[PDB]
């Protein structure tokens, strides 16, 4: 049984992986939140999704991307000119190998920091053993 | 079998209890939409996610939040000074016992009623039985 | 075994299917990205979630819709009055029969064309077989 759900804590910025550190949901502990990098121990088919809130009063842009292991398999950007909450989100659905890492990265922005409300997060689960 | 998926017929406000009353989707039937609860029959883990639209027009702000009985597990907000459509969404993986009650909770703000057309969803499904 | 995830590399505007042509998974080949459609090929309940980026500096509002053959099953807007980048997003649980086409359709407005960097993505997976 894999899968996890955490929250994002602190605020970030920049050009960083996330690490979501208020950990829900962590079967099997393959998510690691010290990384903020969900780790492949089995072959197989699995689904992520992200929700990541920009930092308001503050900017006006920001995206984050999920990665696998150093390729980009998902983008997103929040953009707002008047400096308002948005979000970028995204899932999606990847074939892993073992040892593959999947993560969310900030691609430039400024990222929500949302204490124990959990407004930013990063989900996943198996849903096919090769 | 455990799956379902409803949209929102009308337009709400304020701080209450989200009736998606718009049901598309109920196996088992443990969704009620007299309630806007997901009622737990089975151990295990589930993913649920959400997207509520915003009224356009009237307002700037608008949150949204899932709970589980009395406590928030994801929170999101929709935010547009010029008072545009835009979404509180999130996505969640939660491990559950018999009797938990999963829904989504306004936190303020105004939501947008699309009679059948589903602008605004809850959705769930059981991913792991214990 | 049935999933699939699939982006959007050119841009689109108007009252279309969208093809999401840069596919990234999948199985079984039910998704076709010649036509933007998934076909069901086994009686079943299915998850299908959809993010779709409206275009930047050019107009202001989008509107991204699931279909399950000719019917609405979920609706999504983007809108921003100084032409920002949003999202049109949503996320279903659908019952299908053998033959039933699902797909994302533009209801007006821009999309944004994200070539090989999927911003506009389009996924989907079997829970239950019948």
Redesign the interface.
Known sequence: ?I???A?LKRQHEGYEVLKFDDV??N?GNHYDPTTGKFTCSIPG?Y?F?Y?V?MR?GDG??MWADLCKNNQ???????????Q????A???????LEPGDEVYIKLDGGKAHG?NN???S?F???I??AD
Do not use: C, E, M, P
Not at 84 to 87: F, I, L, R, S, V
Not at 89 to 95: A, C, E, G, K, P
């Open positions: 049984k899968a996890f759900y929250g829900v949901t079967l088919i689904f999704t929700h809130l308001g006006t842009s980009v398999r998902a983008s997103a950007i929040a953009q707002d000119a008047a308002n909450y948005d979000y989100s995204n899932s999606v659905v990847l074939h949302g409300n959990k407004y997060t989900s996943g689960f849903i096919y």
